[PDB]
Amino acid sequence: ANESAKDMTCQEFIDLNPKAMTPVAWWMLHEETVYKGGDTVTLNETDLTQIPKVIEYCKKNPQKNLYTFKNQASNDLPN
Amino acid sequence: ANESAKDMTCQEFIDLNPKAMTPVAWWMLHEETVYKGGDTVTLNETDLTQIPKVIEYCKKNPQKNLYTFKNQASNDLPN
């Protein structure tokens, strides 16, 4: 266990099963959070737009880490 | 994309990468639904205890649907 989704490389992300790619995408994009400002853990329209972009941006850059794709994304949550 | 994390068979789950198995094991313990007046969406100690047990339930019962292992687990609310 714990081969590390946060250390999965982008070439490996685009090669994992497309069933389990969907949970991986939000786990990363919302960075395993406890959720702040409320409990509205639903997919937001930014999130729904980013689910394809976190895949495209990996096949476009196969050398990158999977979890650094959080740095671009705002989601909805407060600082 | 758009393969069924919600219908990954248990023989297919124990064959997915141990990197992305971790997101799927939470995702199944806490569905794409919305929360019920709390913050226990974290990898709390019940979830940390269930994440290995649901992997063990798939390799011992490889015919089951991975998401059946939610129906046993009353963890997706505050207590």
CSV table of N, CA and C in Angstrom, one decimal:
chain,number,residue,atom,x,y,z
A,1,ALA,N,0.8,-1.2,0.0
A,1,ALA,CA,0.0,0.0,0.0
A,1,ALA,C,0.9,1.3,0.0
A,2,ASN,N,0.2,2.4,-0.2
A,2,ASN,CA,0.8,3.8,-0.2
A,2,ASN,C,2.0,4.0,-1.2
A,3,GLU,N,1.8,3.5,-2.4
A,3,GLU,CA,2.7,3.9,-3.5
A,3,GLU,C,2.7,5.4,-3.9
A,4,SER,N,1.6,6.1,-3.4
A,4,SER,CA,1.5,7.6,-3.3
A,4,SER,C,0.8,8.3,-4.5
A,5,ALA,N,-0.5,8.6,-4.4
A,5,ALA,CA,-1.2,9.4,-5.4
A,5,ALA,C,-0.5,10.8,-5.6
A,6,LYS,N,-0.1,11.4,-4.5
A,6,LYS,CA,0.6,12.7,-4.5
A,6,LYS,C,2.1,12.7,-5.0
A,7,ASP,N,2.6,11.5,-5.3
A,7,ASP,CA,3.9,11.3,-6.0
A,7,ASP,C,3.7,10.6,-7.4
A,8,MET,N,2.4,10.3,-7.8
A,8,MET,CA,2.2,9.7,-9.1
A,8,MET,C,2.6,10.7,-10.2
A,9,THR,N,3.5,10.3,-11.1
A,9,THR,CA,3.9,11.2,-12.2
A,9,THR,C,2.9,11.4,-13.3
A,10,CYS,N,2.9,12.4,-14.0
A,10,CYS,CA,1.8,12.7,-15.0
A,10,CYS,C,1.7,11.6,-16.1
A,11,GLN,N,2.8,11.1,-16.5
A,11,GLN,CA,2.8,9.9,-17.4
A,11,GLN,C,2.2,8.7,-16.9
A,12,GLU,N,2.2,8.5,-15.5
A,12,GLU,CA,1.6,7.4,-14.8
A,12,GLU,C,0.1,7.7,-14.6
A,13,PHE,N,-0.2,9.0,-14.3
A,13,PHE,CA,-1.6,9.4,-14.1
A,13,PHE,C,-2.5,9.1,-15.3
A,14,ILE,N,-2.0,9.5,-16.5
A,14,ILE,CA,-2.7,9.2,-17.8
A,14,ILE,C,-2.7,7.7,-18.2
A,15,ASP,N,-2.1,6.9,-17.4
A,15,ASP,CA,-2.0,5.4,-17.6
A,15,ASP,C,-2.7,4.6,-16.5
A,16,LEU,N,-3.1,5.1,-15.4
A,16,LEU,CA,-4.0,4.5,-14.4
A,16,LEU,C,-5.4,4.3,-15.0
A,17,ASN,N,-6.2,3.4,-14.4
A,17,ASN,CA,-7.6,3.1,-15.0
A,17,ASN,C,-8.5,4.3,-14.9
A,18,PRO,N,-9.2,4.7,-16.0
A,18,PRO,CA,-10.1,5.8,-16.0
A,18,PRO,C,-11.3,5.8,-15.0
A,19,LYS,N,-11.6,4.6,-14.4
A,19,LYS,CA,-12.5,4.5,-13.3
A,19,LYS,C,-11.9,5.3,-12.1
A,20,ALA,N,-10.8,4.9,-11.7
A,20,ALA,CA,-10.1,5.5,-10.5
A,20,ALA,C,-9.4,6.9,-10.8
A,21,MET,N,-9.3,7.3,-12.0
A,21,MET,CA,-8.8,8.6,-12.3
A,21,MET,C,-9.8,9.7,-11.8
A,22,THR,N,-11.1,9.5,-11.8
A,22,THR,CA,-12.1,10.5,-11.3
A,22,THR,C,-12.0,10.9,-9.8
A,23,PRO,N,-11.9,9.9,-8.9
A,23,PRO,CA,-11.6,10.2,-7.5
A,23,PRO,C,-10.2,10.9,-7.3
A,24,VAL,N,-9.2,10.4,-8.0
A,24,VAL,CA,-7.8,10.9,-7.9
A,24,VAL,C,-7.8,12.4,-8.3
A,25,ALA,N,-8.6,12.8,-9.3
A,25,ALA,CA,-8.6,14.2,-9.8
A,25,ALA,C,-9.2,15.1,-8.7
A,26,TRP,N,-10.2,14.8,-8.0
A,26,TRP,CA,-10.7,15.7,-6.9
A,26,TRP,C,-9.9,15.6,-5.7
A,27,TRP,N,-9.4,14.4,-5.3
A,27,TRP,CA,-8.5,14.3,-4.1
A,27,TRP,C,-7.3,15.2,-4.2
A,28,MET,N,-6.7,15.4,-5.4
A,28,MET,CA,-5.6,16.3,-5.8
A,28,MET,C,-6.1,17.7,-5.8
A,29,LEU,N,-7.2,18.0,-6.6
A,29,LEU,CA,-7.6,19.4,-6.9
A,29,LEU,C,-8.1,20.1,-5.6
A,30,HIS,N,-8.7,19.4,-4.7
A,30,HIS,CA,-9.1,19.9,-3.4
A,30,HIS,C,-8.1,19.5,-2.2
A,31,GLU,N,-7.0,18.9,-2.6
A,31,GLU,CA,-5.9,18.5,-1.7
A,31,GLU,C,-6.3,17.9,-0.4
A,32,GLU,N,-7.1,16.8,-0.4
A,32,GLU,CA,-7.5,16.0,0.7
A,32,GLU,C,-8.1,16.7,1.9
A,33,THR,N,-8.6,18.0,1.6
A,33,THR,CA,-9.1,19.0,2.6
A,33,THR,C,-10.2,18.5,3.6
A,34,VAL,N,-10.2,19.1,4.8
A,34,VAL,CA,-11.3,18.9,5.7
A,34,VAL,C,-12.5,19.8,5.4
A,35,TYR,N,-12.4,20.7,4.5
A,35,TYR,CA,-13.4,21.6,4.0
A,35,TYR,C,-13.7,22.8,4.9
A,36,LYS,N,-13.5,24.0,4.5
A,36,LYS,CA,-13.6,25.3,5.2
A,36,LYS,C,-14.7,26.2,4.7
A,37,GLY,N,-15.2,27.1,5.5
A,37,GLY,CA,-16.2,28.1,5.2
A,37,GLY,C,-17.6,27.5,5.2
A,38,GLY,N,-17.8,26.2,5.2
A,38,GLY,CA,-19.0,25.4,5.2
A,38,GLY,C,-18.8,23.9,5.0
A,39,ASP,N,-19.8,23.2,4.6
A,39,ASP,CA,-19.7,21.8,4.3
A,39,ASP,C,-20.3,21.4,2.9
A,40,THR,N,-20.3,22.4,2.0
A,40,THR,CA,-20.8,22.3,0.6
A,40,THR,C,-19.7,21.6,-0.3
A,41,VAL,N,-19.4,20.4,0.1
A,41,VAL,CA,-18.3,19.5,-0.6
A,41,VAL,C,-18.7,19.1,-2.0
A,42,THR,N,-19.9,19.5,-2.5
A,42,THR,CA,-20.3,19.3,-3.9
A,42,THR,C,-19.3,19.8,-4.9
A,43,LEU,N,-19.3,19.2,-6.1
A,43,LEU,CA,-18.6,19.8,-7.3
A,43,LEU,C,-19.1,21.2,-7.7
A,44,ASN,N,-18.2,22.2,-7.7
A,44,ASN,CA,-18.5,23.5,-8.1
A,44,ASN,C,-18.2,23.6,-9.6
A,45,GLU,N,-18.7,24.7,-10.3
A,45,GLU,CA,-18.5,24.7,-11.8
A,45,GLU,C,-17.0,25.0,-12.2
A,46,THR,N,-16.3,25.6,-11.4
A,46,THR,CA,-14.8,25.7,-11.5
A,46,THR,C,-14.2,24.2,-11.4
A,47,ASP,N,-14.6,23.5,-10.5
A,47,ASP,CA,-14.1,22.1,-10.3
A,47,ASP,C,-14.5,21.2,-11.5
A,48,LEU,N,-15.7,21.3,-12.0
A,48,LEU,CA,-16.2,20.6,-13.1
A,48,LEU,C,-15.4,20.9,-14.4
A,49,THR,N,-15.0,22.2,-14.5
A,49,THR,CA,-14.2,22.7,-15.6
A,49,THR,C,-12.7,22.2,-15.4
A,50,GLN,N,-12.2,22.1,-14.2
A,50,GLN,CA,-10.8,21.6,-14.0
A,50,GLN,C,-10.7,20.1,-14.0
A,51,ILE,N,-11.7,19.3,-13.8
A,51,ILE,CA,-11.6,17.8,-13.9
A,51,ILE,C,-11.0,17.3,-15.3
A,52,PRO,N,-11.4,17.9,-16.5
A,52,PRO,CA,-10.7,17.6,-17.7
A,52,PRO,C,-9.3,18.3,-17.8
A,53,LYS,N,-9.1,19.5,-17.3
A,53,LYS,CA,-7.9,20.2,-17.4
A,53,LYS,C,-6.7,19.6,-16.6
A,54,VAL,N,-7.0,19.0,-15.5
A,54,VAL,CA,-6.0,18.2,-14.7
A,54,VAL,C,-5.5,16.9,-15.4
A,55,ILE,N,-6.3,16.4,-16.4
A,55,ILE,CA,-5.9,15.3,-17.3
A,55,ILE,C,-5.1,15.8,-18.5
A,56,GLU,N,-5.7,16.8,-19.2
A,56,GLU,CA,-5.1,17.4,-20.4
A,56,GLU,C,-3.7,18.0,-20.0
A,57,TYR,N,-3.6,18.7,-18.9
A,57,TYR,CA,-2.4,19.3,-18.5
A,57,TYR,C,-1.3,18.3,-18.1
A,58,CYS,N,-1.7,17.0,-17.8
A,58,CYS,CA,-0.8,15.9,-17.5
A,58,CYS,C,-0.3,15.3,-18.8
A,59,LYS,N,-1.2,14.9,-19.8
A,59,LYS,CA,-0.7,14.4,-21.1
A,59,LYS,C,0.1,15.4,-21.9
A,60,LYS,N,-0.2,16.7,-21.7
A,60,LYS,CA,0.6,17.8,-22.2
A,60,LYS,C,1.9,18.0,-21.6
A,61,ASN,N,2.1,17.6,-20.3
A,61,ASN,CA,3.3,17.7,-19.5
A,61,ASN,C,3.6,16.4,-18.7
A,62,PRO,N,3.9,15.2,-19.4
A,62,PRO,CA,4.0,13.9,-18.8
A,62,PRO,C,5.1,13.8,-17.7
A,63,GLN,N,6.1,14.7,-17.6
A,63,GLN,CA,7.2,14.8,-16.7
A,63,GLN,C,6.8,15.3,-15.3
A,64,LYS,N,5.7,16.1,-15.2
A,64,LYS,CA,5.3,16.8,-14.0
A,64,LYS,C,4.8,15.9,-12.9
A,65,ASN,N,4.7,16.3,-11.7
A,65,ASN,CA,4.0,15.6,-10.6
A,65,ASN,C,2.5,15.8,-10.7
A,66,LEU,N,1.7,14.8,-10.2
A,66,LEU,CA,0.2,15.0,-10.3
A,66,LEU,C,-0.3,16.0,-9.3
A,67,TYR,N,0.3,16.2,-8.1
A,67,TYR,CA,-0.3,17.0,-7.1
A,67,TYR,C,0.0,18.5,-7.2
A,68,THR,N,1.0,18.9,-7.8
A,68,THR,CA,1.3,20.4,-8.1
A,68,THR,C,0.2,21.0,-8.9
A,69,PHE,N,-0.6,20.3,-9.6
A,69,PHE,CA,-1.8,20.8,-10.3
A,69,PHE,C,-2.9,21.4,-9.4
A,70,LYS,N,-2.7,21.3,-8.0
A,70,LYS,CA,-3.5,22.1,-7.0
A,70,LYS,C,-3.1,23.6,-7.1
A,71,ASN,N,-1.9,23.9,-7.4
A,71,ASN,CA,-1.4,25.3,-7.3
A,71,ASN,C,-2.1,26.4,-8.2
A,72,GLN,N,-2.6,25.9,-9.3
A,72,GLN,CA,-3.4,26.7,-10.3
A,72,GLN,C,-4.9,26.9,-9.9
A,73,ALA,N,-5.4,26.0,-9.1
A,73,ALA,CA,-6.9,25.9,-8.8
A,73,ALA,C,-7.4,26.6,-7.6
A,74,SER,N,-8.4,27.4,-7.7
A,74,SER,CA,-9.0,28.2,-6.6
A,74,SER,C,-10.2,27.5,-5.9
A,75,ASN,N,-10.9,26.5,-6.6
A,75,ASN,CA,-12.1,25.9,-6.2
A,75,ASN,C,-13.2,26.8,-5.7
A,76,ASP,N,-13.3,27.1,-4.4
A,76,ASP,CA,-14.4,27.8,-3.7
A,76,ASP,C,-14.1,28.1,-2.3
A,77,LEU,N,-13.3,27.3,-1.6
A,77,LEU,CA,-12.9,27.4,-0.2
A,77,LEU,C,-12.2,28.7,0.2
A,78,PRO,N,-12.3,29.2,1.4
A,78,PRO,CA,-11.6,30.5,1.9
A,78,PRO,C,-10.2,30.2,2.5
A,79,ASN,N,-9.4,31.2,2.4
A,79,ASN,CA,-8.1,31.2,3.2
A,79,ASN,C,-8.2,31.7,4.6
B,1,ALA,N,-11.8,9.4,-20.6
B,1,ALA,CA,-12.3,9.4,-19.2
B,1,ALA,C,-13.8,8.8,-19.2
B,2,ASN,N,-14.4,8.9,-18.0
B,2,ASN,CA,-15.8,8.4,-17.8
B,2,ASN,C,-15.9,6.9,-17.9
B,3,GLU,N,-15.3,6.2,-17.0
B,3,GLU,CA,-15.3,4.8,-16.6
B,3,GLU,C,-15.9,4.9,-15.1
B,4,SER,N,-16.5,3.8,-14.7
B,4,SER,CA,-17.3,3.8,-13.5
B,4,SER,C,-16.5,3.4,-12.2
B,5,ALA,N,-16.0,4.4,-11.5
B,5,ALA,CA,-15.4,4.1,-10.2
B,5,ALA,C,-16.4,3.4,-9.3
B,6,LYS,N,-17.7,3.8,-9.4
B,6,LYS,CA,-18.9,3.2,-8.7
B,6,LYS,C,-19.3,1.8,-9.1
B,7,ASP,N,-18.7,1.3,-10.2
B,7,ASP,CA,-18.8,-0.1,-10.6
B,7,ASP,C,-17.5,-0.8,-10.9
B,8,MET,N,-16.4,-0.3,-10.4
B,8,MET,CA,-15.1,-1.0,-10.5
B,8,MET,C,-15.3,-2.4,-9.8
B,9,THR,N,-15.1,-3.5,-10.4
B,9,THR,CA,-15.3,-4.8,-9.8
B,9,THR,C,-14.1,-5.1,-8.8
B,10,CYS,N,-14.3,-5.9,-7.8
B,10,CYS,CA,-13.3,-6.0,-6.8
B,10,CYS,C,-12.0,-6.7,-7.3
B,11,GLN,N,-12.1,-7.5,-8.3
B,11,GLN,CA,-10.9,-8.0,-9.1
B,11,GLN,C,-10.1,-6.9,-9.8
B,12,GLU,N,-10.9,-5.9,-10.4
B,12,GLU,CA,-10.3,-4.8,-11.1
B,12,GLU,C,-9.7,-3.8,-10.1
B,13,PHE,N,-10.4,-3.6,-8.9
B,13,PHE,CA,-9.9,-2.7,-7.8
B,13,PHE,C,-8.5,-3.2,-7.3
B,14,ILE,N,-8.4,-4.4,-6.9
B,14,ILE,CA,-7.1,-5.0,-6.4
B,14,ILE,C,-6.0,-5.1,-7.5
B,15,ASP,N,-6.4,-4.8,-8.8
B,15,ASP,CA,-5.5,-4.6,-9.9
B,15,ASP,C,-5.1,-3.2,-10.3
B,16,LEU,N,-5.9,-2.2,-9.9
B,16,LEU,CA,-5.6,-0.7,-10.0
B,16,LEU,C,-4.3,-0.4,-9.2
B,17,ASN,N,-3.7,0.7,-9.6
B,17,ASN,CA,-2.4,1.1,-8.9
B,17,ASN,C,-2.6,1.5,-7.5
B,18,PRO,N,-1.7,1.0,-6.5
B,18,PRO,CA,-1.8,1.4,-5.1
B,18,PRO,C,-1.7,2.9,-4.8
B,19,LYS,N,-1.1,3.7,-5.7
B,19,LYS,CA,-1.1,5.2,-5.7
B,19,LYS,C,-2.5,5.6,-5.7
B,20,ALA,N,-3.3,5.3,-6.7
B,20,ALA,CA,-4.7,5.8,-6.9
B,20,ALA,C,-5.7,5.0,-6.1
B,21,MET,N,-5.4,3.8,-5.6
B,21,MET,CA,-6.3,3.0,-4.7
B,21,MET,C,-6.7,3.8,-3.5
B,22,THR,N,-5.8,4.6,-3.0
B,22,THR,CA,-6.1,5.4,-1.7
B,22,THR,C,-7.2,6.5,-1.9
B,23,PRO,N,-7.2,7.4,-2.9
B,23,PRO,CA,-8.3,8.2,-3.3
B,23,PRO,C,-9.6,7.4,-3.5
B,24,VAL,N,-9.6,6.3,-4.2
B,24,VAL,CA,-10.8,5.5,-4.4
B,24,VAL,C,-11.4,4.9,-3.1
B,25,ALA,N,-10.5,4.5,-2.2
B,25,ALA,CA,-10.9,3.9,-0.9
B,25,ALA,C,-11.6,5.0,0.0
B,26,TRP,N,-11.1,6.3,0.0
B,26,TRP,CA,-12.0,7.3,0.6
B,26,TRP,C,-13.2,7.6,-0.2
B,27,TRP,N,-13.1,7.7,-1.6
B,27,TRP,CA,-14.2,8.1,-2.3
B,27,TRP,C,-15.4,7.3,-2.2
B,28,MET,N,-15.2,6.0,-2.0
B,28,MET,CA,-16.2,5.0,-1.7
B,28,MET,C,-16.7,5.0,-0.3
B,29,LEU,N,-15.8,5.2,0.7
B,29,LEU,CA,-16.2,5.5,2.1
B,29,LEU,C,-17.0,6.8,2.3
B,30,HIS,N,-16.9,7.8,1.4
B,30,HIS,CA,-17.6,9.1,1.4
B,30,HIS,C,-17.9,9.5,0.0
B,31,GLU,N,-19.1,9.2,-0.4
B,31,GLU,CA,-19.6,9.4,-1.8
B,31,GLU,C,-19.6,10.8,-2.3
B,32,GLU,N,-19.8,11.0,-3.6
B,32,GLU,CA,-19.9,12.4,-4.3
B,32,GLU,C,-21.1,13.2,-3.8
B,33,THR,N,-21.9,12.7,-2.8
B,33,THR,CA,-23.0,13.4,-2.1
B,33,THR,C,-22.4,14.6,-1.3
B,34,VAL,N,-23.3,15.4,-0.6
B,34,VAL,CA,-23.0,16.6,0.2
B,34,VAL,C,-23.2,16.3,1.6
B,35,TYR,N,-22.4,17.0,2.5
B,35,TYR,CA,-22.4,16.7,3.9
B,35,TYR,C,-23.6,17.2,4.8
B,36,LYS,N,-23.6,16.7,6.0
B,36,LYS,CA,-24.8,16.8,6.9
B,36,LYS,C,-24.5,17.5,8.2
B,37,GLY,N,-24.0,18.7,8.1
B,37,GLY,CA,-23.8,19.7,9.3
B,37,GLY,C,-22.5,19.4,10.1
B,38,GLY,N,-21.4,19.0,9.5
B,38,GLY,CA,-20.2,18.7,10.2
B,38,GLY,C,-18.9,18.7,9.2
B,39,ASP,N,-17.8,18.3,9.8
B,39,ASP,CA,-16.5,18.4,9.1
B,39,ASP,C,-15.7,17.0,9.0
B,40,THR,N,-16.3,15.9,9.4
B,40,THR,CA,-15.7,14.6,9.5
B,40,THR,C,-15.3,13.9,8.1
B,41,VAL,N,-15.4,14.7,7.0
B,41,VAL,CA,-14.9,14.3,5.7
B,41,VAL,C,-13.4,14.0,5.6
B,42,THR,N,-12.6,14.5,6.6
B,42,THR,CA,-11.2,14.1,6.9
B,42,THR,C,-11.0,12.6,6.9
B,43,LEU,N,-9.8,12.1,6.7
B,43,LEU,CA,-9.3,10.7,7.0
B,43,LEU,C,-9.2,10.6,8.6
B,44,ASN,N,-10.4,10.6,9.2
B,44,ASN,CA,-10.6,10.3,10.6
B,44,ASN,C,-10.2,8.9,11.0
B,45,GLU,N,-10.1,8.5,12.3
B,45,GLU,CA,-9.6,7.2,12.7
B,45,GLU,C,-10.5,6.0,12.3
B,46,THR,N,-11.8,6.2,12.2
B,46,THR,CA,-12.7,5.2,11.6
B,46,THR,C,-12.4,4.9,10.2
B,47,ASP,N,-12.3,6.0,9.4
B,47,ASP,CA,-11.9,5.9,7.9
B,47,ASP,C,-10.5,5.3,7.8
B,48,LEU,N,-9.5,5.7,8.5
B,48,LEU,CA,-8.1,5.1,8.5
B,48,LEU,C,-8.1,3.6,8.9
B,49,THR,N,-9.1,3.2,9.7
B,49,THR,CA,-9.3,1.8,10.0
B,49,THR,C,-10.1,1.0,8.9
B,50,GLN,N,-11.0,1.7,8.2
B,50,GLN,CA,-11.8,1.1,7.1
B,50,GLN,C,-11.1,1.0,5.8
B,51,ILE,N,-10.2,2.0,5.4
B,51,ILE,CA,-9.5,2.0,4.2
B,51,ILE,C,-8.7,0.7,3.9
B,52,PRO,N,-8.0,0.1,4.9
B,52,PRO,CA,-7.4,-1.2,4.7
B,52,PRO,C,-8.5,-2.4,4.7
B,53,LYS,N,-9.5,-2.3,5.5
B,53,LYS,CA,-10.5,-3.4,5.6
B,53,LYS,C,-11.3,-3.6,4.3
B,54,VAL,N,-11.6,-2.5,3.6
B,54,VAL,CA,-12.3,-2.6,2.3
B,54,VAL,C,-11.4,-3.1,1.2
B,55,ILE,N,-10.1,-2.9,1.3
B,55,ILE,CA,-9.2,-3.5,0.3
B,55,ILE,C,-9.1,-5.0,0.6
B,56,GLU,N,-9.0,-5.4,1.9
B,56,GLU,CA,-9.1,-6.8,2.3
B,56,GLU,C,-10.4,-7.5,1.9
B,57,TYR,N,-11.5,-6.8,2.0
B,57,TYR,CA,-12.8,-7.3,1.6
B,57,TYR,C,-12.9,-7.6,0.1
B,58,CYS,N,-12.2,-6.8,-0.8
B,58,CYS,CA,-12.2,-7.0,-2.2
B,58,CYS,C,-11.4,-8.3,-2.6
B,59,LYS,N,-10.1,-8.5,-2.1
B,59,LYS,CA,-9.3,-9.6,-2.5
B,59,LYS,C,-9.9,-11.0,-2.0
B,60,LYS,N,-10.6,-11.0,-0.8
B,60,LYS,CA,-11.3,-12.2,-0.3
B,60,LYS,C,-12.7,-12.4,-1.0
B,61,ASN,N,-13.3,-11.4,-1.6
B,61,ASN,CA,-14.6,-11.5,-2.3
B,61,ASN,C,-14.5,-10.7,-3.7
B,62,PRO,N,-13.7,-11.2,-4.6
B,62,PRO,CA,-13.3,-10.5,-5.9
B,62,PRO,C,-14.5,-10.2,-6.9
B,63,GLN,N,-15.7,-10.9,-6.7
B,63,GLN,CA,-16.8,-10.7,-7.5
B,63,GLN,C,-17.7,-9.5,-7.2
B,64,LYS,N,-17.5,-8.9,-6.0
B,64,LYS,CA,-18.4,-7.8,-5.5
B,64,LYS,C,-18.1,-6.5,-6.2
B,65,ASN,N,-19.0,-5.5,-6.2
B,65,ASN,CA,-18.8,-4.2,-6.7
B,65,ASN,C,-18.1,-3.4,-5.6
B,66,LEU,N,-17.0,-2.8,-5.8
B,66,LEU,CA,-16.2,-2.0,-4.9
B,66,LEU,C,-17.1,-1.0,-4.1
B,67,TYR,N,-18.1,-0.4,-4.7
B,67,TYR,CA,-19.0,0.6,-4.0
B,67,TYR,C,-20.0,-0.1,-3.1
B,68,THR,N,-20.2,-1.4,-3.1
B,68,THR,CA,-21.1,-2.1,-2.1
B,68,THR,C,-20.5,-1.9,-0.7
B,69,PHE,N,-19.2,-1.7,-0.5
B,69,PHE,CA,-18.4,-1.6,0.7
B,69,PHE,C,-18.7,-0.2,1.4
B,70,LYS,N,-19.5,0.7,0.8
B,70,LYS,CA,-20.1,1.8,1.5
B,70,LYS,C,-21.3,1.5,2.4
B,71,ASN,N,-22.1,0.5,1.9
B,71,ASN,CA,-23.4,0.2,2.6
B,71,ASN,C,-23.3,-0.3,4.1
B,72,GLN,N,-22.2,-1.0,4.3
B,72,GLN,CA,-21.7,-1.4,5.7
B,72,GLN,C,-21.3,-0.2,6.6
B,73,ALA,N,-20.8,0.9,6.0
B,73,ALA,CA,-20.0,1.9,6.7
B,73,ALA,C,-20.9,3.2,7.0
B,74,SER,N,-21.3,3.5,8.2
B,74,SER,CA,-22.1,4.7,8.6
B,74,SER,C,-21.3,5.9,8.9
B,75,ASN,N,-20.1,6.1,8.3
B,75,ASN,CA,-19.1,7.1,8.7
B,75,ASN,C,-19.3,8.5,8.1
B,76,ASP,N,-20.1,8.7,7.1
B,76,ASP,CA,-20.2,9.9,6.3
B,76,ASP,C,-21.2,11.0,6.9
B,77,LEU,N,-21.1,11.2,8.3
B,77,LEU,CA,-21.8,12.2,9.0
B,77,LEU,C,-21.0,12.5,10.4
B,78,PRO,N,-21.2,13.7,11.0
B,78,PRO,CA,-20.7,14.0,12.3
B,78,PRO,C,-21.3,13.1,13.4
B,79,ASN,N,-20.5,12.9,14.5
B,79,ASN,CA,-20.9,12.2,15.7
B,79,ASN,C,-20.5,12.8,17.0
